[PDB]
C-alpha cells in the first residue's frame, strides 16, 4: 500500500528547515513547498504526511481498520491556519467555510444571468490602485502584473506603466521616467467575463458580458467547492476583513460506508482515497438496473442500492419503477443479497454527492448531496430548500476464403478509392502469404473473394486465464489506403457488458500497437492478431485500460484485479452462451467444432471453482460471484444441450 | 600582454574622466547661465508666491511641498511648522567662476519670532575632480561636503533643544532637589547644523547616516523641488 | 484665487521646461564638442581594441555579458556575430537637426552580413510634448529607427526554419510544411518594431540609453567589472 496521494500536505527536508508542501504528481511523489515552490520528487516514506485532500464525492477506505470497505465522502471540514499577508502573525485554528476568495469571480464559478445559467470560462479583471499622492486609478491586470493581488497590497512601479490606466480620481500625476510610484491596491475587480451558457432553467446571450451589463450577473456561491488549499490567498473575516494566506490544513470528512453507516468527523489521515474503483462496486445511493440474461425484461424497472457487504460482493438494492401516469414512482420490492455482477450502472440517473443539477421542465439548481431510501434525489435548491425529487426530471452536470461475404458480417458501406487497385491487391496477397505461413495454433482467419478487404477472424482464449477456452469473433476491413493506416477492426459483442477494458460491446476495439490504445506500413495483420491473442486476452485482464500498471504490486491493484477477473469469467460465460445461440453465418461449423469440447471443459472448470496454482487471480470466490456464476453456468448448460451437444 | 593593454585603456579612461570633469564643470557653467535665464522666471515664482506680483500669495508653499515629499515630510515635526511656514523662499545660487564647485540652497525667511537671520545658507559643495584614491568613483557631480550656518534663537522659542529634568533627594536636608539638562530635540532645523566631520574621518555610524540623509536631501532640493516646485506642490510630482 | 496663482506658476513651469529643453540642446552641443575632445582618447581606444596602435578580444561581447541588461540579449547564436562588434561610438546629431544619437556599431563585416558599418539611430525628445510638457525630464528616447540589415543568406539569426508533416484537408496529400518563425536574438535589436511590441520597444530604449551613458564612456569599467550595473 502506497501512503501518499494527490494534493496531500507533506513536510520534508527542503532547506534543512522542515517546510510544508502539497504533492502534485503521484506516480501515475512530486511536492511543491509553501514559501518558495520547487516541484520535486521525494521518497514517499521520507515525506511526512500531515493532511489529505479528501474532497467531496471521493471514494475512500479506512486507513487502519482491517476491513477494505469503501465509502463516499459526503461533506468535508477543513481546519486551516492563516497568516496575515506580509506578517508572521498566524491565526489557527480556523474553518475553511469562513474564508473568502479575493476576486469576485473565478474560473468556473457558476453564474446566473437574465435567466441563463453558465460557467465563467474566461474573464478580464482589474486592479484599482491608490497612489501616494492620493490618486485612484484602474489598471488592467495585463499591466498590473508589471508592478513589483489582494486588498491592502503595496507595490512599486515605473510611472510609464500608468500611461494606459484610467484615472478615476485624484491629481493625475506627471508620468516622469526617472522615479517610480508606490501604490496600494484598494480592490480587485472584474472587467468582462466570457461564458459558455451550457443550459438554462430561446437563444443564448453573448459569450462575453462586459461591465455595462455585468451588474446583472449574480454569482451562485451556494455551489462552492473551493476548499482551502495550502497557499490559497483568501480574505479572513474577523470574529473587519483582511487578506490572509493559509499555512496548514486538517481535513475531517464524513464518509458514507458501503454497509450504510454514516460516520462523521473522520480525520482524513485515517482515510485514503481510491484511484481505481472496480466498475461494479456500488456505493449506497447508486441508480442501478438488473442485467441478468432472462430476469426483468421491463426496461422501466430500475434500482437504487442501499448496502453492499464488500467481502460478500452482494449488494442489496431496492427495485422501483415509474408510474405510467403522474410524477410518481411505484415500489417494486426490496430484494437483498443481489450479485453486483448482475447489476449495472443505470445509463441515466447518475447522482453522486454534491453535484450541481438542473430541473427538467420554481427552483432550478441545487447540490445533490444524498440519495434517498425511496430513490428520490435529495436536492433542488432555490435557497436551501431541501426538497426530495425523483430522477424523472433532473439533469446532472489456417487461411481460407469464401466466394461471397455475408451481408450482416464483415464490413459494408465502404467504397474508398485505393491509390492503386493493383497495388492494394498486391499488399493483400502479401498478407495472405504471411497468414498462411503463420497461424499454426490459437488464431485463425478467413476472407471473401467478392471483397478482398473484408476479413473475419477467430481468436481463442489462452490457458490458465479467465478467458480460458471461450471463443471470440472479429470482423475486419483493410482500408483501401492500407498499409497507410491501421486496419478497421470490430469485435461483434454477443454480450452487453464490457468483456474486457479495451474490447467494447459497441465494437470499436482498440489496442496499444494500433495507436488507439504505433502503426506502421511494415506492420501486418499477423502482428495485430498475435497481439490481440497476446494482450487483449492477457493472463490478468486488469490493467490494459488506462495506465493502470501504477497499481501493480499494490493492495488495491490486487483486489480489483481479482474482482475484474471474476467479472470477466461471468461475462465470457455469457458471451459463449450467446455465441452458441446465434453463431455468425461466417463460421457456423467452427463454433460447434470447438465448443463440442471447449464449452464442457469450461463448465467443468466453473463447477470445480464452486468447490491450486491455476495461473490467474480469482480466489476466493465471493458469494455474489457464486450466485452469478451458477446462474450463467446453468444458462450455458441449457444452451449447450439445446445446441445438440450433450455432455462430453 | 592583454592586461597591460586593459591598463592602458584604464589610464585612457582616467584622462577621459578628467575631461568629463571639465565637461561637468562646463555643465555647471551652463546651469549658471541658464540660472540667469531663469532669474526672471524663478523671481516671478517667488513674487507670486509672496504677493509681490499678480488669501495672499500661496500660503505655506514650501511647507506644503515638503509635506507632499516624503523625504522632507519625515523631517518636519509638528513643532517645526510654526517656524518653517516663515520660509519666504528657497533658491539655489551657484558658485561663480573660479570658486569651488558648490551651490547654496539659501532659505529666505520673513522677519520671524524664532531667530533673527534673514537667510539661512546651507551651502553644499560638489567634487568635479576624480580623487587619486578612486577616480572612477566620479559618477558625476557627487555631493560630499557641507557647510551649514549658525542660528541664534529668540528667547523662549528655540526648537532644536529641549530641557529634560531629574530629581534627587538630599540626604541631610531631605529636599528633593532638581537638575536640568538641554538635550537634542528632533527638529527639521537640526538639518542646518550637521555634525561637524572629524578630520581623521572618525565618524560614528549615526554621523555617516545623517550626513548621507542631509546630502541626498540637498541634491533633491536642488534638482527636483526648486526647479519643478509646482509639480510637487499640487501633487502632480510622484515623489516616490 | 490661490488655484489661479498655482496655474500661473504652472505656465511658468512650462516656460522653464522650454528653457530646459534649450538647456539640454546646448548640453548636446557640449556633447558634440566633447565628442571631438574625446576623439583622441576614443580613437586610441578604438586602435587598441583593433590593435591598430600599441587587441582586446571579445571586448564588447564581454561588456555585454557582464551587464544584466545586455547579457540577457546575447543568445548562443548571437556570440559568433556579436564578438565581431569591434567598436562603438555615439555620433551626436549635427546642430539644427533633430536631437538624435546614432549608435555606431561598425561590426567589422565577417561572414554573416554585408553591412560595412551598422547603426541603430535613435530619437530624443528634443522639446516637450505640448500635451504634457512636465513629462520632459530631459532627452527621453521616443523611437528607434533601426537599420535594414543586408543578411548573408544562411546566417539570418532573426528567423528559424521549422518543418512538420501534414496532410491537405479532404485531399489527404502529404506535405512537409515549412515555415520561417521569428527567432529571439540580440540582432532583433537592429530591426525593432515599426512605430508586447511596446514592451520590447521600451526595453530597447532602456538598453540604448544605458549603452550611451554608461557602456561607451565607461567601457573599461565594465570589461573589468569595477563599475556597477546601474
Features of this protein?
heterotrimer; A: alpha+beta; SH3 type barrels; eight-stranded antiparallel sheet; seven-stranded antiparallel sheet; globular; B: 240 residues; 38% helix; cytosolic protein; Ubiquitylation; trimeric
Write the layout of secondary structure elements.
The complex is a heterotrimer, with one copy of chain A (648 residues) and two copies of chain B.
Chain A: E1 9-15, E2 17-23, E3 30-33, E4 40-41, E5 48-51, E6 59-62, E7 70-84, E8 90-95, E9 110-112, E10 117-131, E11 136-140, H1 141-144, E12 154-158, E13 166-169, E14 180-195, E15 208-209, H2 211-214, E16 218-219, E17 233-237, E18 241-257, E19 262-267, E20 271-273, E21 287-290, E22 301-309, E23 314-322, E24 329-333, E25 338-339, E26 343-345, E27 355-359, E28 367-368, E29 394-396, E30 401-402, H3 421-437, E31 443-448, E32 454-461, E33 469-477, E34 488-491, H4 525-534, H5 555-581, H6 588-609, H7 623-642
Parallel strand pairs in A: 30-31
Antiparallel strand pairs in A: 1-2, 1-5, 2-3, 3-4, 6-7, 6-20, 7-8, 7-18, 9-10, 9-16, 10-11, 10-14, 11-13, 12-14, 14-15, 17-18, 18-19, 21-22, 21-26, 22-23, 23-24, 23-25, 27-28, 27-29, 31-32, 32-33, 33-34
Helix pairs in contact in A: 5-6, 5-7, 6-7
Chain B: H1 2-49, H2 61-68, H3 70-73, H4 81-84, E1 87-94, E2 102-109, E3 119-127, E4 142-147, E5 161-169, E6 176-184, H5 205-225, H6 229-233
Antiparallel strand pairs in B: 1-2, 2-3, 3-4, 5-6
Short structural description:
Chain B: Keywords: Acetylation, Cytoplasm, Lipoprotein, Methylation, Neurogenesis, Nucleus, Phosphoprotein, Prenylation. Chain B: It is found in: Nucleus; Melanosome; Cytoplasm. The complex is a heterotrimer, with one copy of chain A (648 residues) and two copies of chain B. Chain A is 16% helix and 31% strand.
Would you mind describing this structure in some detail?
The complex is a heterotrimer, with one copy of chain A (648 residues) and two copies of chain B. With 648 residues, chain A is α+β, with helices and mostly antiparallel strands. Chain A folds into four domains: 1-51, SH3 type barrels (Roll); 110-221, no CATH class; 287-396, no CATH class; 398-648, Ubiquitin Conjugating Enzyme, CATH 3.10.110.10. The longest helix of chain A has 27 residues, at 555-581. With 240 residues, chain B is an alpha+beta fold. Helices cover 38% and strands 20% of the residues of chain B. Chain B has a four-stranded antiparallel beta sheet with strand order 1-2-3-4. In chain B, strand 1 (87-94) and strand 2 (102-109) form a beta hairpin. The B-C interface holds B 2, 5-6, 8-10, 12-13, 15-16, 19-20, 23, 26-27, 30-31, 34, 37-38, 41, 44-45, 48-49, 54-55, 57-59, 136, 227-231, 233-234, 236 and C 1-2, 5-6, 8-10, 12-13, 15-16, 19-20, 22-23, 26-27, 30, 34, 37-38, 41-42, 44-45, 48, 55-57, 134, 217-221, 223-224, 226-227. Chain A: Keywords: ATP-binding, Coiled coil, Cytoplasm, Nucleotide-binding, Nucleus, Phosphoprotein, Transferase, Transport, Ubl conjugation, Ubl conjugation pathway.
Amino acid at each position: 500500500q502506497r501512503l501518499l496521494f494527490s494534493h496531500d500536505l507533506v513536510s520534508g527536508r527542503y532547506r534543512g528547515s522542515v517546510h510544508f508542501g502539497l504533492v502534485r504528481l503521484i506516480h501515475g511523489v512530486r511536492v511543491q513547498w509553501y514559501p518558495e515552490g520547487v516541484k520535486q520528487h521525494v521518497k514517499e516514506t521520507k515525506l511526512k504526511l500531515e493532511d489529505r485532500s479528501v474532497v467531496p464525492r471521493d471514494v475512500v477506505r479506512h486507513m487502519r481498520s482491517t476491513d477494505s470497505q469503501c465509502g463516499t465522502v459526503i461533506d468535508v471540514n477543513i481546519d486551516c491556519a492563516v497568516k496575515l499577508i506580509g506578517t508572521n502573525c498566524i491565526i489557527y485554528p480556523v474553518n475553511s467555510k469562513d474564508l473568502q476568495h479575493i476576486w469576485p469571480f473565478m474560473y468556473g464559478d457558476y453564474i446566473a444571468y437574465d435567466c441563463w445559467l453558465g460557467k465563467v470560462y474566461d474573464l478580464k479583471n482589474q486592479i484599482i490602485l491608490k497612489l501616494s499622492n492620493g490618486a485612484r486609478c484602474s489598471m488592467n491586470t495585463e499591466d498590473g502584473a508589471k508592478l513589483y493581488f489582494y486588498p491592502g497590497q503595496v507595490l512599486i512601479g515605473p510611472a510609464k506603466i500608468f500611461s494606459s490606466v484610467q484615472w478615476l480620481s485624484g491629481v493625475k500625476p506627471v508620468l516622469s521616467t526617472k522615479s517610480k510610484f508606490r501604490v496600494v491596491v484598494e480592490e480587485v475587480q472584474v472587467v468582462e467575463l466570457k461564458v459558455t451558457w451550457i443550459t438554462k432553467s430561446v437563444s443564448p446571450p453573448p459569450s462575453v458580458i462586459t461591465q455595462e451589463n455585468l451588474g446583472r450577473v449574480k454569482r451562485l456561491g451556494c455551489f462552492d467547492h473551493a476548499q482551502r488549499q495550502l497557499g490559497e490567498r483568501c480574505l479572513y473575516v474577523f470574529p473587519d476583513r483582511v487578506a490572509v494566506e493559509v499555512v496548514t490544513t486538517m481535513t475531517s470528512a464524513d464518509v458514507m460506508w458501503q454497509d450504510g453507516s454514516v460516520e462523521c468527523n473522520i480525520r482524513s489521515n485515517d482515510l485514503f482515497p481510491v484511484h481505481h474503483l472496480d466498475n461494479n462496486e456500488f456505493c449506497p445511493g447508486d441508480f442501478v438496473v438488473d442485467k441478468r440474461v432472462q430476469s426483468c425484461p421491463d426496461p422501466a424497472v430500475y434500482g437504487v442500492v442501499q448496502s453492499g457487504d464488500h467481502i460478500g460482493r452482494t449488494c442489496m438494492v431496492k427495485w422501483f419503477k415509474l408510474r405510467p401516469s403522474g410524477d410518481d414512482v411505484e415500489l417494486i420490492g426490496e430484494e437483498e443479497d443481489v450479485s453486483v455482477y448482475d447489476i449495472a450502472d443505470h445509463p441515466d440517473f447518475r447522482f453522486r454527492t454534491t453535484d450541481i443539477v438542473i430541473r427538467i421542465g420554481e427552483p432550478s439548481v441545487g447540490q445533490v448531496a444524498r440519495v434517498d431510501v425511496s430513490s428520490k434525489v435529495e436536492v433542488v435548491w432555490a435557497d436551501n430548500s431541501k426538497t426530495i425529487i425523483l430522477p424523472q426530471h433532473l439533469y446532472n452536470i489456417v487461411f481460407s476464403v469464401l466466394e461471397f461475404a455475408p451481408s450482416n458480417h464483415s464490413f459494408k458501406k465502404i467504397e474508398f478509392q485505393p491509390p492503386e487497385a493493383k497495388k492494394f491487391f498486391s499488399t493483400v496477397r502479401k498478407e495472405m502469404a504471411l497468414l498462411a505461413t503463420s497461424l499454426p495454433e490459437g488464431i485463425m482467419v478467413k476472407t471473401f473473394e467478392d471483397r478482398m478487404d473484408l476479413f473475419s477472424a477467430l481468436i481463442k482464449g489462452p490457458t490458465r486465464t479467465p478467458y480460458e477456452d471461450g471463443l471470440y469473433l472479429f470482423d475486419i476491413q483493410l482500408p483501401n489506403i492500407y498499409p497507410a493506416v491501421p486496419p478497421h477492426f470490430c469485435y461483434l459483442s454477443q454480450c452487453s457488458g464490457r468483456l474486457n477494458p479495451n474490447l467494447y460491446d459497441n465494437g470499436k476495439v482498440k489496442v496499444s500497437l494500433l495507436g488507439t490504445w504505433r502503426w506502421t506500413s511494415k506492420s501486418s495483420l499477423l502482428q495485430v492478431l498475435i497481439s490481440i491473442q497476446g494482450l487483449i486476452l492477457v493472463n490478468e485482464p486488469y490493467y490494459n485500460e488506462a495506465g493502470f500498471d501504477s497499481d501493480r504490486g499494490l493492495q488495491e491493484g490486487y483486489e480489483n484485479s481479482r474482482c475484474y477477473n471474476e467479472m470477466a469469467l461471468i461475462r465470457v460465460v455469457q458471451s459463449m452462451t450467446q455465441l452458441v445461440r446465434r453463431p455468425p453465418e461466417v463460421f457456423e461449423q467452427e463454433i460447434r467444432q470447438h465448443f463440442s469440447t471447449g464449452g464442457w471443459r469450461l463448465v467443468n472448470r466453473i463447477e470445480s471453482w464452486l468447490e491450486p496454482d491455476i495461473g490467474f487471480p480469482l480466489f476466493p470466490l465471493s458469494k455474489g460471484f457464486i450466485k452469478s456464476i451458477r446462474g450463467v453456468l446453468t444458462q450455458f448448460r441449457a444452451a449447450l444441450l439445446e445446441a445438440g451437444m450433450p455432455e462430453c | 600582454v592583454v592586461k597591460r593593454r586593459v591598463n592602458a585603456l584604464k589610464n585612457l579612461q582616467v584622462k577621459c574622466a578628467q575631461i568629463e570633469a571639465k565637461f561637468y564643470e562646463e555643465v555647471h557653467d551652463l546651469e549658471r547661465k541658464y540660472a540667469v535665464l531663469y532669474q526672471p522666471l524663478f523671481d516671478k515664482r517667488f513674487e507670486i508666491i509672496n504677493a509681490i506680483y499678480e488669501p495672499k500669495g500661496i500660503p505655506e508653499f514650501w511647507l506644503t511641498v515638503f509635506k507632499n515629499v516624503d523625504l522632507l515630510s519625515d523631517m518636519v515635526q509638528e513643532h517645526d511648522e510654526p517656524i518653517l511656514k516663515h520660509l519666504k523662499d528657497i533658491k539655489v545660487k551657484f558658485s561663480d567662476a573660479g570658486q569651488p564647485m558648490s551651490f547654496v540652497l539659501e532659505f529666505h525667511f520673513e522677519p520671524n519670532e524664532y531667530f533673527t537671520n534673514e537667510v539661512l545658507t546651507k551651502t553644499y559643495r560638489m567634487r568635479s575632480e576624480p580623487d587619486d584614491s578612486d577616480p572612477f568613483s566620479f559618477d558625476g557631480p557627487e555631493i560630499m561636503g557641507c557647510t551649514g550656518c549658525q542660528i541664534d534663537w529668540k528667547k523662549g522659542k528655540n526648537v532644536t533643544l529641549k530641557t529634560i529634568k531629574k530629581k534627587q533627594k538630599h540626604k541631610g536636608r531631605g529636599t528633593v532637589r532638581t537638575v536640568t539638562k538641554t538635550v537634542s530635540n528632533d527638529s527639521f532645523f537640526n538639518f542646518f547644523a550637521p555634525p561637524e566631520v572629524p578630520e581623521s574621518g572618525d565618524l560614528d555610524d549615526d554621523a555617516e547616516a545623517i550626513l548621507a540623509a542631509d546630502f541626498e536631501i540637498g541634491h533633491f532640493l536642488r534638482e527636483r523641488i526648486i526647479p519643478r516646485s509646482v509639480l510637487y506642490f499640487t501633487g502632480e510630482a510622484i515623489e516616490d
